[PDB]
Amino acid sequence: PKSFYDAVGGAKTFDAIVSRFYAQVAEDEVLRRVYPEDDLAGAEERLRMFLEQYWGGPRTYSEQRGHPRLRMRHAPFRISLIERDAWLRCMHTAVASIDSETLDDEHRRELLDYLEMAAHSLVNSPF
Amino acid sequence: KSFYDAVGGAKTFDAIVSRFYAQVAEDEVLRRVYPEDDLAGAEERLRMFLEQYWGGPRTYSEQRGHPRLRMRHAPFRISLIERDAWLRCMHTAVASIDSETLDDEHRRELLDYLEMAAHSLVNSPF
Amino acid sequence: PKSFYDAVGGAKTFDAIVSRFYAQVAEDEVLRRVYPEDDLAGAEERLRMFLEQYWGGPRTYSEQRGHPRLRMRHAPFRISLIERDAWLRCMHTAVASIDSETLDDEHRRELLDYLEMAAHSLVNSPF
Amino acid sequence: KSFYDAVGGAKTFDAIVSRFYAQVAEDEVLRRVYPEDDLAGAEERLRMFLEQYWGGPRTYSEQRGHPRLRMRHAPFRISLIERDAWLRCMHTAVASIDSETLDDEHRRELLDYLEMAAHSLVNSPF
Amino acid sequence: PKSFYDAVGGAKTFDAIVSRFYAQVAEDEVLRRVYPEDDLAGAEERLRMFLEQYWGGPRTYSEQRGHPRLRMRHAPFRISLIERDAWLRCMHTAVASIDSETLDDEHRRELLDYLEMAAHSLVNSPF
Amino acid sequence: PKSFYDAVGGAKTFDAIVSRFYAQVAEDEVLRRVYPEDDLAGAEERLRMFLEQYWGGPRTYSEQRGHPRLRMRHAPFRISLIERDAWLRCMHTAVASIDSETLDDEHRRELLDYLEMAAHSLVNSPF
Amino acid sequence: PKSFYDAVGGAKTFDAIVSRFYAQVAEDEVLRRVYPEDDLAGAEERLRMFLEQYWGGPRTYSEQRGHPRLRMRHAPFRISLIERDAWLRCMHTAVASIDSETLDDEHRRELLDYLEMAAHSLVNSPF
Amino acid sequence: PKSFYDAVGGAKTFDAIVSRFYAQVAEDEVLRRVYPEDDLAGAEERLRMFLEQYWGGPRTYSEQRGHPRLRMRHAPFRISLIERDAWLRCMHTAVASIDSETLDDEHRRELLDYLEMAAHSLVNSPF
Amino acid sequence: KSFYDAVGGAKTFDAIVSRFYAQVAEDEVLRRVYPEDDLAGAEERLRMFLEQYWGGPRTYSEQRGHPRLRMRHAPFRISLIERDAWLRCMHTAVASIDSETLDDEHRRELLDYLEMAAHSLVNSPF
Amino acid sequence: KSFYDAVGGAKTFDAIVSRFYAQVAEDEVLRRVYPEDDLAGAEERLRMFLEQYWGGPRTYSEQRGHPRLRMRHAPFRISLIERDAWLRCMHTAVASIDSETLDDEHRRELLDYLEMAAHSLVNSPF
Amino acid sequence: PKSFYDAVGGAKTFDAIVSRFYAQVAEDEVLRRVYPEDDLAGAEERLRMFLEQYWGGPRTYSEQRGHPRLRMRHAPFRISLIERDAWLRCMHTAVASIDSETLDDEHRRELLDYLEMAAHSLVNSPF
Amino acid sequence: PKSFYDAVGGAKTFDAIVSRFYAQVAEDEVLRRVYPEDDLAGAEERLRMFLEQYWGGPRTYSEQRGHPRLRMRHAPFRISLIERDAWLRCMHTAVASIDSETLDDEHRRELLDYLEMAAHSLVNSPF
Ligand code: HEM
Ligand code: HEM
Ligand code: HEM
Ligand code: HEM
Ligand code: HEM
Ligand code: HEM
Ligand code: HEM
Ligand code: HEM
Ligand code: HEM
Ligand code: HEM
Ligand code: HEM
Ligand code: HEM
Ligand SMILES: [C-]#N
Ligand SMILES: [C-]#N
Ligand SMILES: [C-]#N
Ligand SMILES: [C-]#N
Ligand SMILES: [C-]#N
Ligand SMILES: [C-]#N
């Protein structure tokens, strides 16, 4: 279709990204100890639902979670440039794992531009 | 041989669920409850769920994860009235399938399942 | 202008109501099992913040928790008429413990009418 | 006026549940699922629950604690067959109450609840 | 004659089936959400012990856990055809991983017949 | 037949005993440290159900929990004479709180003889 | 005499400071974008209660608001260096309006050192 | 009585102080949110053991816990003047509950002086 | 009647444990493991524990809390050697009590208990 | 170098444990506590544990998992009577092993251990 | 270069040993049941920290945790010869994975000699 | 280049800054009392790695040190306003030792703003 979500391959693509992302998080010395060790599956699910929604996919995230209120969702954690950069490192790996046939050069840039902006907007701590 | 295969698999479930969701679209009661405009996503997810439920492809759980139907319906006020409207549309959809595709035994099992599941999802007094 | 909140004695009144409500809950065969055993302090605080906001007091609740989304916040719990009635019993006890000088008949009635309707609107289970 | 008082309260619920459980005793399907002999305790617990549910005395939760119906039914295999037999018996018991006592709207409300609750408690394929 | 347990290679075989089953579970989007994430080792062991006993091996299971009472042990979980099918998928691959020298065609048949019947018997939910 | 259960006032009596016992348990320097502190309500309920069943009341305990297997259910805890004595002190207080019209002298003596014997039977540790 | 609160003039002084502070906030281009849009009366009350309690005066703050969680209560708002500085300007203005007889050199310096450290510590945003 | 501990009545006195102190904590708006709600028995016990040891009594505290290292022990907690003042308020109440024959004016003063100083030494946060 | 009362109550326990801890002070193996000087506190706590264990006053748990003997012995290296020295001191202390106070059956019961308890507290290979 | 190898390894532990469990089968006290008939699995598991404990093969943990002996003995009432019967039978078994295979130092070390462990496993006043 | 820590490659080497140790622990049937499943990252971190300090590197361990007090750290666990042997197997594998260029034959002997003596010193249980 | 780290000269710049910083600490009357007593070599290395990572350089800090827990890591040390100011003096001196060609006015301002905020936020002591 027309939606960014469908253009990039819909649910299959977002599951692939968020899934490979959280696998990176597991091996990430920084983020390993940020994400609640006991709730890894649920965390992945919420991030996927959110990104699906954001890019014009299902609006399930909002029905389940409310307005994103990301600032307040991340308030429990001390996110400095170090966490921001680790998150982006993991996400860049995840996104780079998607072939160019599925994910355009134009769609890739748009996505990465958003992620880069969003991650910085959520920094809430000097260390 | 799975139920899914026995009843004609993908074509049958697409026929049922597309006919069901075409009805929802024109149903006063249900239009009020389903998200406001394009029911394309709702149709896809329902179809995928039923296909996996009856032994077909596992693409529902692949795309939506472990089923948590009560929680997924929780945002919506499903009273007896919505339940009955849903069941009417679904009975209509199933009735559109011929006896050669969906034999009497499989028809009864499918309908028995859907009625009880629909009752089990009622989550609101109004 | 005079707010319902100030008219009824503000923070002090709402703290009396909610604390006494939560003390009744602990004593209630139905409800003591519903409220998470390990988070009664926070639970009490969130209800208090919500009610203070609803009735014209501080708007901290919305800042901290977003839109009330009460249906989704109660979704984790099977609330039938039995839990609704037990909730109203406890709340009625709590409200009755406020004197009439503080909470006059008119404001008492308005409060109780709201709580009755709100409790009825949160029923989400047959049993 | 609670629903409980409107329909005649304890007198009515004892009449409904007495007549219900008298049928259970002779229903081969249900006789097999209920504990093997004296159905007095099962009758008393179902009656107490219904009385509390509809706004009467709190004896049920005082004696039984917070309602946990799915878990309390979990030891028993309640398939569609048991559900239907339970419902048949309940309808038959409710039909014994006159219209002066249980008017049309209340009768409908009660039956609607019981049908929905029974579907919601099915917990076995056979 | 020989026990079923000894005939198929006893503890080593049952350990292999159940550990491979449990690794499949972790990679199963349906089932990884159903098994308590904090208790996977203990859950594996209990299944292992049950199976060893059922097939004529050590009766430690009964000593430690009492009668199987599998219906009540599974009551805490909503097991529909979806979870039943996912369980059978994971178990089928685990069993398939045992070679024919260890696990006869006749024995393999008998084991699988039982697991398929038992998994179906434990469905307790419409969804 | 007349059950001991009915003779001593049935569900109401057993609820009063077990509820008062557990309130003693909370003020007990020995026992408050033995009972998992996040599970006191479920603990109270299971003991109530067992005691109702033992004395000829509802057989719900057996349905929900199987055979009592009290030895194996207390195996997780180090029960020495110190814990036995503390348990009995609290239970004696709880039983003493029931009036003589509800619980007459001979039923009281029978109930207490059983509890004393049962408490001693669950001793599993030297300290 | 004894407490910092009494030494500096108590309720009188803190009302003078915070009222003058929050009258500054109302006209402040930076801060009016961050404080909740209209009536700053509740904001002033809460800040004043907090400061009064912090310095050893009445415990009204915690009685009405609970245990201080300043980071979380500020988390809804974007407090960058710009807002921190703006807040400190208003506060320095407010403190400078108190004469030396009421707030002597020693207490003035102590107060301002604290406010400086506190404000810096509440920065939670890059922009 | 030659040791401070013995002079003031030993174990009985210290149990009474710390017991009553912890009861005050539970009623304290500031402090009940600071002490982990699932570990109150243990926390009371550790403080008792520490205080017994500090004042010339049993040296069990250091056997069990090592060197006090109170600063590091309190590092997980934001202790500002507000928490310091509330702790001291609860402790003054506890100490005041002991008669003067048991704890005479001279020992009371030494104990209070120490507790005031120690609470101040543990402040680690601006709010 | 409690074991505690049967053996003469406080006087007997004070006699046993005082004589026990007087031995400890001169036992080179035990002197090395008990904290370095005044064993008055250790003696008090052991006595209170044993008095409560055998049905006497609850002073032990009142002052010390719920018993956690393994954790309380954990700071100390109790090998077979320390276990045997402790047992010998206790045997010697118990032998100081006459048969009129501590009859043959209660003596055996006490000794059997101490032996079991002492073995269960060994926590070191050296 | 391993205690297991020093005492003659598999042959020795099979010798000790087989003769031990032969005694068990004929022991009134023990016969009552071990599972009612074929002591074959019990013998196997004890042997494997002792073998692993003393530095031999890891077959025990491979087949049985992390050791949890207290919990594994919990189902059985092991009073001092059962402890003493077990120890007698074990001492008999060990005494059937000659000094050249099990020298005086390894014998004492083995017996010290078995005594301590058996004492630590008493879990019942009767 | 000078300290043992530098001689063997410092932080890099110790991270490799401990990390590889903890991977072996996860596949050890004895030890995976001993280490708290919910705290593996922290466990590895604390062991790394301790070893780094012990061999003359950073003294962060003592700053954060105090004197090692390893007997008391291990008291919560039943460490018999079986656990001792499993630990040493895992650690020997981890150490053996370090090349002889990084870890001298003389430094390897010294490291392993310490580890073998320490593991034995921490045995605290018969089974 | 594009990362802050690269734009300001990367490894060379950070080594120069932190080398010059820690050379001062050694002879600083205030700071020498707070840093571990002798060889400030490890401290310097650790601070450098941290700042390099923080500004988008190598991840060597998290690789060797884990996730930043700066508050906890400074917890052992009494950092009042005096130590804060002494630290900032030494750091401002080190930063001033870098020429404008290497370290932009723009980048210098950003770096200094961060260091001031970070340092203020790490104050953990009244004295
Ligand atoms: C900047 C570094 C970030 C870190 C360290 C981080 C970390 C976390 C953590 C620890 C959680 C809680 C996990 C859970 O329990 O759900 C979370 C939640 C979440 N994050 Fe992030 N995150 C970062 C950035 C982002 C970004 C850039 C996005 C979107 C573009 C995002 C979207 C979400 C969503 C949608 C949730 C779930 C919110 C909910 O509960 O509904 N995060 N994040
Ligand atoms: C009782 C009457 C029912 C009503 C009024 C109802 C209504 C809805 C609505 C409004 C949604 C959200 C649609 C969207 O995504 O925009 C939904 C989702 C869904 N429904 Fe129903 N539904 C009913 C019964 C059922 C039954 C009986 C089933 C299957 C047995 C079912 C299966 C599903 C599934 C699989 C989803 C998607 C869940 C997810 O993956 O997020 N529903 N339903
Ligand atoms: C009908 C019976 C009700 C039951 C059984 C019930 C029970 C609960 C429970 C168990 C929670 C979770 C406690 C927590 O952790 O926060 C909760 C949350 C809450 N409830 Fe209720 N409740 C009922 C009705 C109401 C009503 C009538 C109101 C308002 C008038 C209300 C307002 C709230 C609020 C504001 C929260 C916190 C939501 C948040 O997280 O922000 N509840 N309730
Ligand atoms: C679906 C068909 C049903 C069947 C076959 C069934 C059967 C049973 C059985 C066998 C028991 C245990 C009886 C005993 O104590 O010996 C029971 C308990 C109970 N049932 Fe049902 N039941 C059904 C539906 C319902 C419904 C619809 C309700 C209420 C709306 C209900 C309410 C209860 C209550 C309150 C108990 C006692 C729970 C307790 O306090 O332990 N049942 N049922
Ligand atoms: C139908 C799909 C099934 C699902 C989703 C499922 C899931 C579960 C879960 C979540 C548990 C609790 C894990 C724990 O011990 O903490 C469990 C326990 C257990 N399951 Fe299943 N299971 C299924 C089928 C089966 C089958 C077919 C068998 C036997 C052939 C079985 C045997 C057991 C046993 C023996 C336990 C441990 C009971 C105890 O606590 O003693 N399960 N299962
Ligand atoms: C001798 C001292 C005793 C102690 C220290 C003790 C303690 C405990 C504890 C800690 C639990 C587990 C609570 C939980 O986490 O669920 C428990 C369970 C239970 N206890 Fe006791 N108990 C004692 C004696 C008794 C006696 C004498 C009886 C019967 C007269 C009894 C009956 C039960 C029952 C029925 C359960 C629930 C088992 C289940 O899970 O179904 N206990 N006890
Ligand atoms: C750094 C610059 C600061 C800014 C921009 C700021 C801004 C705000 C805002 C917008 C609110 C919510 C206002 C409302 O209720 O409508 C608030 C609340 C509050 N602030 Fe600040 N603040 C700052 C620093 C401080 C400092 C330094 C303190 C005390 C030392 C402080 C103490 C408080 C308190 C006690 C509350 C009320 C918390 C509650 O009970 O809900 N703030 N602040
Ligand atoms: C200044 C206000 C204080 C606050 C808010 C406070 C709070 C706390 C909290 C929350 C804990 C952890 C509870 C636990 O799990 O053990 C704790 C531990 C402890 N506190 Fe305090 N405390 C304060 C002052 C003091 C003072 C003045 C002393 C000594 C006179 C003290 C002695 C201790 C000891 C010995 C522990 C246990 C350390 C251990 O784990 O061994 N505290 N405190
Ligand atoms: C096995 C040989 C034993 C040795 C070497 C030993 C040694 C010790 C030592 C060194 C202490 C600390 C003394 C102090 O306060 O300075 C202690 C405490 C104690 N011991 Fe033993 N002990 C042994 C066996 C036993 C036995 C068999 C019992 C009781 C049956 C026992 C009961 C106690 C009690 C109640 C305490 C005080 C615990 C507390 O409240 O902190 N001990 N022991
Ligand atoms: C104190 C007297 C003892 C008695 C009466 C006793 C009795 C028993 C019994 C009845 C069983 C279950 C047998 C079966 O599987 O059918 C058992 C299991 C076992 N016993 Fe003992 N035992 C004693 C002491 C010991 C000692 C001292 C050890 C080792 C030092 C030991 C090691 C084991 C082991 C390893 C098992 C198998 C545990 C498992 O893997 O499931 N026992 N014992
Ligand atoms: C003998 C076999 C051993 C076993 C079974 C064992 C097991 C454990 C376990 C389960 C923990 C708790 C993990 C945690 O921190 O959550 C732990 C902690 C620890 N162990 Fe071991 N360990 C053994 C030997 C050793 C040895 C030989 C050393 C030193 C060379 C050591 C050093 C440590 C340290 C430093 C900690 C963390 C202490 C702290 O909390 O600060 N362990 N061990
Ligand atoms: C406020 C004034 C400060 C003082 C007095 C101070 C002092 C110290 C001291 C004494 C240490 C331990 C040194 C050692 O390992 O021997 C340390 C560690 C450290 N500091 Fe600071 N510091 C201050 C501010 C800062 C700031 C602003 C930063 C970064 C923006 C910082 C970053 C670090 C790092 C990364 C460590 C090592 C943490 C670790 O990996 O263990 N410090 N500091
Ligand atoms: C549902 N649709
Ligand atoms: C159900 N009766
Ligand atoms: C903040 N005011
Ligand atoms: C212990 N003495
Ligand atoms: C054990 N034998
Ligand atoms: C800190 N440096």
UniProtKB/Swiss-Prot annotation, chains A, C, E, F, G, H, K, L:
Chief subcellular location = membrane
Q: Annotated Gene Ontology MF terms? A: heme binding; metal ion binding; oxygen binding; oxygen carrier activity
> Isodityrosine (Tyr-Tyr) cross-link located where?
22-35
Tell me which domain of life the UniProt entry assigns to the organism this sequence originates from. Bacteria
The cross-references to InterPro entries, in alphabetical order and at most eight, read: GlbO/GLB3-like, Globin-like_sf, Globin/Proto, Globin_bac-like_CS, Hemoglobin_trunc
Describe the processing and modification events after translation. Answer: Contains L-DOPA (3',4'-dihydroxyphenylalanine).
Q: How is the cofactor bound?
A: Binds 1 heme group per subunit.
Signal peptide coordinates: none
Gene Ontology cellular-component terms listed: plasma membrane
- Give me the residues that bind heme, please: 74
On whether DNA-binding is a keyword of this UniProt record, the answer is no
Instruction: Supply the Pfam families for this chain.
Output: Bac_globin (PF01152)
Q: Which cofactor does it need?
A: heme
Q: Which residues are annotated as modified residue 3',4'-dihydroxyphenylalanine in the UniProt record?
A: 35
Q: Where in the cell is it found?
A: Cell membrane
Q: How does it sit in the membrane?
A: Peripheral membrane protein
- Would the keyword Membrane turn up in this protein's UniProt record? yes
Tell me how this protein assembles.
Homododecamer.
The UniProt similarity line reads:
Belongs to the truncated hemoglobin family. Group II subfamily.
The role this protein plays is:
When expressed in E.coli and M.smegmatis, HbO increases oxygen uptake. Membrane vesicles of E.coli carrying HbO show a respiration activity about twice that of membranes without HbO. HbO seems to interact with a terminal oxidase. Therefore, HbO could participate in oxygen/electron-transfer process, suggesting a function related to the facilitation of oxygen transfer during aerobic metabolism of M.tuberculosis.
Concerning PANTHER family, the annotation shows:
TWO-ON-TWO HEMOGLOBIN-3
Report what the protein is called.
Group 2 truncated hemoglobin GlbO
Q: Which organism is it from?
A: Mycobacterium tuberculosis (strain CDC 1551 / Oshkosh)
- Lineage of the source organism? Bacteria, Bacillati, Actinomycetota, Actinomycetes, Mycobacteriales
Swiss-Prot record, chains B, D, I, J:
Query: What is any Pfam family matched here?
Result: Bac_globin
- Its transmembrane ranges are none
Q: How does it get modified after it is made? A: Contains L-DOPA (3',4'-dihydroxyphenylalanine).
Q: Where does heme bind?
A: 73
Report residues of the Isodityrosine (Tyr-Tyr) crosslink.
21-34
The record's GO CC annotations read: plasma membrane
Q: Where is the signal peptide?
A: none
Q: Its Gene Ontology molecular function terms?
A: heme binding; metal ion binding; oxygen binding; oxygen carrier activity
List localization entries: Cell membrane
Q: Which residues carry this modification: 3',4'-dihydroxyphenylalanine?
A: 34
Q: Which Gene3D superfamilies match?
A: Globins
* Entry similarity comment: Belongs to the truncated hemoglobin family. Group II subfamily.
The protein's role, per its UniProt record: When expressed in E.coli and M.smegmatis, HbO increases oxygen uptake. Membrane vesicles of E.coli carrying HbO show a respiration activity about twice that of membranes without HbO. HbO seems to interact with a terminal oxidase. Therefore, HbO could participate in oxygen/electron-transfer process, suggesting a function related to the facilitation of oxygen transfer during aerobic metabolism of M.tuberculosis.
Quaternary arrangement and interactors, per the entry? Homododecamer.
Q: Which PANTHER family would you find in this protein's record?
A: TWO-ON-TWO HEMOGLOBIN-3
Give the protein name, as stated in the record: Group 2 truncated hemoglobin GlbO
Source organism of the structure: Mycobacterium tuberculosis (strain CDC 1551 / Oshkosh)
